[PDB]
Design an enzyme around this catalytic site. Sequence first.
Site, mmCIF file in Angstrom:
data_model
loop_
_atom_site.group_PDB
_atom_site.id
_atom_site.type_symbol
_atom_site.label_atom_id
_atom_site.label_comp_id
_atom_site.label_asym_id
_atom_site.label_seq_id
_atom_site.Cartn_x
_atom_site.Cartn_y
_atom_site.Cartn_z
ATOM 1 N N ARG A 68 46.109 42.768 37.119
ATOM 2 C CA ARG A 68 46.914 43.863 37.648
ATOM 3 C C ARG A 68 47.244 44.946 36.632
ATOM 4 O O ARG A 68 47.792 45.978 37.027
ATOM 5 C CB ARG A 68 48.206 43.324 38.239
ATOM 6 C CG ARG A 68 48.043 42.786 39.640
ATOM 7 C CD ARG A 68 49.402 42.291 40.141
ATOM 8 N NE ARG A 68 49.740 40.989 39.565
ATOM 9 C CZ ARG A 68 50.947 40.439 39.630
ATOM 10 N NH1 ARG A 68 51.930 41.071 40.249
ATOM 11 N NH2 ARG A 68 51.172 39.243 39.092
ATOM 12 N N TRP A 119 36.251 43.524 38.665
ATOM 13 C CA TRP A 119 35.235 42.872 37.863
ATOM 14 C C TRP A 119 35.690 41.443 37.562
ATOM 15 O O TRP A 119 36.866 41.098 37.694
ATOM 16 C CB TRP A 119 34.961 43.640 36.582
ATOM 17 C CG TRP A 119 36.167 43.985 35.757
ATOM 18 C CD1 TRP A 119 36.798 43.181 34.840
ATOM 19 C CD2 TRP A 119 36.842 45.245 35.716
ATOM 20 N NE1 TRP A 119 37.846 43.861 34.260
ATOM 21 C CE2 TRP A 119 37.892 45.129 34.783
ATOM 22 C CE3 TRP A 119 36.671 46.460 36.392
ATOM 23 C CZ2 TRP A 119 38.762 46.184 34.506
ATOM 24 C CZ3 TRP A 119 37.540 47.503 36.118
ATOM 25 C CH2 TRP A 119 38.566 47.361 35.182
ATOM 26 N N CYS A 172 47.283 37.727 41.027
ATOM 27 C CA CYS A 172 46.205 38.492 40.406
ATOM 28 C C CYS A 172 46.531 38.747 38.944
ATOM 29 O O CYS A 172 47.467 39.487 38.631
ATOM 30 C CB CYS A 172 45.982 39.822 41.127
ATOM 31 S SG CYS A 172 44.774 40.833 40.253
ATOM 32 N N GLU A 210 36.129 32.547 36.459
ATOM 33 C CA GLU A 210 35.878 32.469 37.892
ATOM 34 C C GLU A 210 34.474 31.956 38.164
ATOM 35 O O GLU A 210 34.268 31.130 39.060
ATOM 36 C CB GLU A 210 36.077 33.833 38.550
ATOM 37 C CG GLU A 210 37.480 34.400 38.394
ATOM 38 C CD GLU A 210 37.588 35.765 39.069
ATOM 39 O OE1 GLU A 210 37.620 35.784 40.315
ATOM 40 O OE2 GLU A 210 37.625 36.801 38.366
HETATM 41 C C1 HEM Z 1 39.748 44.730 38.075
HETATM 42 C C2 HEM Z 1 39.749 43.507 37.534
HETATM 43 C C3 HEM Z 1 40.347 42.277 38.250
HETATM 44 C C4 HEM Z 1 40.413 41.057 37.697
HETATM 45 C C5 HEM Z 1 39.921 40.690 36.281
HETATM 46 C C6 HEM Z 1 41.024 40.165 38.655
HETATM 47 C C7 HEM Z 1 41.252 38.830 38.466
HETATM 48 C C8 HEM Z 1 41.708 37.989 39.447
HETATM 49 C C9 HEM Z 1 41.576 36.553 39.469
HETATM 50 C C10 HEM Z 1 40.895 35.695 38.374
HETATM 51 C C11 HEM Z 1 42.188 36.115 40.574
HETATM 52 C C12 HEM Z 1 42.284 34.656 41.046
HETATM 53 C C13 HEM Z 1 40.922 34.511 41.724
HETATM 54 C C14 HEM Z 1 40.584 33.134 42.207
HETATM 55 O O1 HEM Z 1 40.786 32.178 41.432
HETATM 56 O O2 HEM Z 1 40.079 33.005 43.351
HETATM 57 C C15 HEM Z 1 42.693 37.261 41.313
HETATM 58 C C16 HEM Z 1 43.381 37.214 42.515
HETATM 59 C C17 HEM Z 1 43.707 38.290 43.300
HETATM 60 N N1 HEM Z 1 43.353 39.592 42.999
HETATM 61 FE FE1 HEM Z 1 42.684 40.350 41.248
HETATM 62 N N2 HEM Z 1 41.321 40.889 39.803
HETATM 63 C C18 HEM Z 1 40.909 42.199 39.590
HETATM 64 C C19 HEM Z 1 41.001 43.245 40.497
HETATM 65 C C20 HEM Z 1 41.667 43.233 41.690
HETATM 66 C C21 HEM Z 1 41.740 44.309 42.666
HETATM 67 C C22 HEM Z 1 41.033 45.696 42.539
HETATM 68 C C23 HEM Z 1 42.498 43.860 43.679
HETATM 69 C C24 HEM Z 1 42.941 44.568 44.983
HETATM 70 C C25 HEM Z 1 42.913 45.902 45.120
HETATM 71 C C26 HEM Z 1 42.910 42.511 43.364
HETATM 72 C C27 HEM Z 1 43.719 41.734 44.145
HETATM 73 C C28 HEM Z 1 43.848 40.385 44.029
HETATM 74 C C29 HEM Z 1 44.517 39.557 44.998
HETATM 75 C C30 HEM Z 1 45.201 40.055 46.303
HETATM 76 C C31 HEM Z 1 44.444 38.299 44.562
HETATM 77 C C32 HEM Z 1 45.055 37.096 45.317
HETATM 78 C C33 HEM Z 1 43.916 36.172 45.692
HETATM 79 C C34 HEM Z 1 44.284 35.177 46.752
HETATM 80 O O3 HEM Z 1 45.497 34.956 47.039
HETATM 81 O O4 HEM Z 1 43.333 34.561 47.303
HETATM 82 N N3 HEM Z 1 42.389 42.161 42.159
HETATM 83 N N4 HEM Z 1 42.387 38.385 40.581
HETATM 84 C C1 LIG Z 2 38.963 41.931 43.121
HETATM 85 C C2 LIG Z 2 38.640 40.609 42.468
HETATM 86 C C3 LIG Z 2 38.462 40.516 41.094
HETATM 87 C C4 LIG Z 2 38.180 39.262 40.527
HETATM 88 N N1 LIG Z 2 37.997 39.169 39.203
HETATM 89 N N2 LIG Z 2 38.049 38.175 41.303
HETATM 90 C C5 LIG Z 2 38.213 38.250 42.646
HETATM 91 C C6 LIG Z 2 38.087 37.027 43.524
HETATM 92 C C7 LIG Z 2 39.529 36.579 43.728
HETATM 93 C C8 LIG Z 2 39.904 36.274 45.155
HETATM 94 C C9 LIG Z 2 39.403 35.167 45.830
HETATM 95 C C10 LIG Z 2 39.783 34.948 47.153
HETATM 96 C C11 LIG Z 2 39.260 33.751 47.900
HETATM 97 C C12 LIG Z 2 40.114 32.596 47.394
HETATM 98 C C13 LIG Z 2 39.484 31.238 47.658
HETATM 99 N N3 LIG Z 2 40.527 30.216 47.512
HETATM 100 C C14 LIG Z 2 41.685 30.582 48.346
HETATM 101 C C15 LIG Z 2 39.993 28.915 47.936
HETATM 102 C C16 LIG Z 2 40.664 35.813 47.788
HETATM 103 C C17 LIG Z 2 41.160 36.913 47.101
HETATM 104 F F1 LIG Z 2 42.016 37.755 47.707
HETATM 105 C C18 LIG Z 2 40.791 37.126 45.780
HETATM 106 F F2 LIG Z 2 41.253 38.198 45.106
HETATM 107 C C19 LIG Z 2 38.519 39.466 43.239
#
Ligand code: HEM
Ligand SMILES: Cc1cc(N)nc(CCc2cc(CCCN(C)C)cc(F)c2F)c1
Lengths: 407, 411
Positions: free
Chosen positions: B111, B280, B108, B285
Amino acid sequence: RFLKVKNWETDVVLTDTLHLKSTLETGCTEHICMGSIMLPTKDQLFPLAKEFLDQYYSSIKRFGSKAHMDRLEEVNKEIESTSTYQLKDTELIYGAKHAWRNASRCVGRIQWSKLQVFDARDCTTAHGMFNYICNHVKYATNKGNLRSAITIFPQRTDGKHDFRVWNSQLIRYAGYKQPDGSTLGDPANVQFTEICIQQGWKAPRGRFDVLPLLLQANGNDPELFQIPPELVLEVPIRHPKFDWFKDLGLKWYGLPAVSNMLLEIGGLEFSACPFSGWYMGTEIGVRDYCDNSRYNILEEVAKKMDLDMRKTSSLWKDQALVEINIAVLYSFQSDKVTIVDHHSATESFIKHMENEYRCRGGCPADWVWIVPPMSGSITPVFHQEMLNYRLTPSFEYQPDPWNTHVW
Amino acid sequence: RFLKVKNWETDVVLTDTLHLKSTLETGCTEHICMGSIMLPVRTKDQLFPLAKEFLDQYYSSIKRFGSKAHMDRLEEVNKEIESTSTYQLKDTELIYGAKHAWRNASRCVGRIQWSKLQVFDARDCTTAHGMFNYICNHVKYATNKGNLRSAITIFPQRTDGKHDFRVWNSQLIRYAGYKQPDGSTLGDPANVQFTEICIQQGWKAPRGRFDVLPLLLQANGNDPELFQIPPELVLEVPIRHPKFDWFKDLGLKWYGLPAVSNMLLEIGGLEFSACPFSGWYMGTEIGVRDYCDNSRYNILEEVAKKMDLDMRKTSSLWKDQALVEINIAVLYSFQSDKVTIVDHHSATESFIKHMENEYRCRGGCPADWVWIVPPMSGSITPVFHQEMLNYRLTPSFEYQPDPWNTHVWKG
Ligand code: HEM
Ligand SMILES: Cc1cc(N)nc(CCc2cc(CCCN(C)C)cc(F)c2F)c1
Ligand code: HEM
Ligand SMILES: Cc1cc(N)nc(CCc2cc(CCCN(C)C)cc(F)c2F)c1
Ligand SMILES: C[C@H](O)[C@H](O)[C@H]1CNc2nc(N)[nH]c(=O)c2N1
Ligand SMILES: C[C@H](O)[C@H](O)[C@H]1CNc2nc(N)[nH]c(=O)c2N1
Ligand SMILES: [Zn+2]
């Protein structure tokens, strides 16, 4: 232990059996992944030699043959006797081609079998090294129809008589720190440009000065040689739509030629083994031109494009980046100098991966390095899972010579 | 031990000690790196050590390690485990746990915001209708008329694995996808299988290109139930481009609220199988992945056609050119409608600052380079040049199997 890699754009799944033959370590553990880290006696030698000869005779379909066993014995005899051994020309060529085949960070490996190997193991002096390198450069450049080549200098002996090319690449532009505080030319080569001057070079103190070769034979002090300018094919960079682009005064050289790596074949170490292919456009246009620690031209180009540089969210850097990389590709193609765009090269690599998985059981690949530094996810390699592991023969990093040279 | 990471653009070298607190596996060995692999019922036996470690971390963070409150809580959790086979988190511990799962999410890039997370305790929920209400309130709160706020809603933890709470949607808000008989896809090709499930469960599909999917909600291990999110709660942004007037006529929009709803939240050995969370969007994305992946909306061709780029040879970089304009358009449209979005330059720069701060105050920041680096313009963002160590800390978000693959249907 028999591992699957999935492509997420195509759902194609490949089964990797080749990683079982891995030898060296990755730097990763079950507790920590170091995937993004840039740089993670007689008894040792014969196992290494045996492993290599085994795969060599397997590849010529003579595993377990008389000639296989005889060669194993002969090398075993030579190691017990001389504490080293010499490769047959056929084994040297095989080993070099396979070191490239095994380079997990190299996206251009579909070409691995069409490598010209120049045996320079008879070289004894830096003037001789220079001659071999000029011939390499000329052969590889081929008037812009670039051809892959490696030149292999004598292998390490006691580590006191190492052959080394002190340049990181055969052809690179000098770098000078200005009194005004900034940097003229290539900032990555500031230290090496100094060692050239600290050793006798007469710098033009320009922005694109081809550095001289600093060649070290048999452990002696390295010597300066200027590559004949007529051997260094350069491309002036213009844009197919922006007339002002030429006024930026940009150019790059056609031949990417890595010269500071260590080639390991069957336990033998070749500390001087310059190799060359042809550029992928993003190496120049994204990294060389737009890295902040390099020529860093983004601001200037965006200014000439009259983009809104107030806010990053206008993506003016991204627009300028695309145009710079259009120019590089357009310029090389216009001058008929071999170049590949990142779309074609990564598609080739997927084709190569499918080829290697089918005919070899896998293909070690470093995603962090294989995915181009722009437009990552619209190239197929972004969606390709990859297993990274270390096969030998291999290219390895080695310390910079000035840090090591008992002067 | 100590580990060093180097930024190759700035030569800043950081020292990681936090990796010593790592527990779970990475998937890698000394012989193979699985760093680009996407995806690398619990008894009291292993539970109290997982509880104790979490409670040590919790009481340490509030500067009460070894206190009587800390010792009493360990004792209380211990007896609760051996007596009831599980335990309940206090509200303070759940909030701490959810924030730290986000803080620990090595994929993420967002963070820097981890400490400003709104935690909605839905552990008193019992029915799919109760779930729907909580999720509506989450969506309304998080959307905040476009001034997005990070939030997570936490439904009851797993017990025997036969009574799970699950949100069957991968994300709370997503567009339907419909496979046509001619083989083409209408809408989001990523959601075809889930759309078919909803249709089979009785959803009347509008069969358009941007149909918000219904929520499919499973409470207490019962069959899931369909609910329509109130459309007034679903904030959407029509996509237009600041210079290209024809871009609006492409008919594109996207929703403002990215809300992941298929992951599992692990806190102190407890498994929260339903824990939708939202923040957000980063522009890429939508503009890179959602719009331009070949397996998604795949609009590069049509955008490049309308731009009249040279599409005959790839070396014209017509794909890269169209990609940038599409991503300018997403960012322009969200900003123009005052919906929170962040571009990949801003997001990555903030993440570097966050990561440096975490190395200083925390001893490390686990980060998955493969995921942190944005899917366009990689090396002109500062994360590309940043060495990163990936390891798994708990609390954590984990993947779990899709519920339709594991659910025992009641009928
Ligand atoms: C607030 C602004 C946030 C931004 C800009 C952001 C951005 C991102 C992006 C771009 C990814 C990769 C997404 C993808 O390509 O599918 C990601 C992954 C992730 N985000 Fe964040 N995120 C935000 C908030 C959060 C919040 C609130 C949480 C949890 C409480 C979170 C937890 C995660 C997790 C667990 C992943 C791993 C995704 C996975 O393994 O599939 N994010 N985030
Ligand atoms: C909170 C938040 C903020 C932000 N900006 N974007 C997102 C979407 C990111 C996201 C996507 C997926 C599916 C992954 C699909 N992939 C495995 C093929 C799983 C996640 F846990 C995750 F966080 C979330
Ligand atoms: C012929 C066309 C070739 C292409 C298009 C190509 C492309 C590339 C690219 C883009 C990289 C990334 C390196 C960087 O970004 O600095 C790379 C790395 C590498 N290439 Fe290839 N290459 C070619 C030929 C060769 C040859 C002929 C060899 C050896 C015989 C070779 C061996 C390597 C090695 C060892 C690396 C990684 C070295 C490191 O880790 O720094 N390549 N290549
Ligand atoms: C033959 C060939 C073809 C092609 N197209 N490109 C190249 C350059 C790629 C490259 C670069 C570096 C420098 C690493 C240090 N740098 C990260 C700061 C080391 C390498 F061994 C290497 F191969 C070579
Ligand atoms: C195979 C590879 O791991 C896969 O395509 C990953 C690459 N990096 C990613 N990075 C982000 N942010 N999101 C993704 O879905 C992916 N996909
Ligand atoms: C820290 C990170 O590993 C470093 O910036 C890498 C990332 N990927 C790369 N990929 C290529 N092809 N070349 C590089 O120099 C790098 N640098
Ligand atoms: Zn790894």
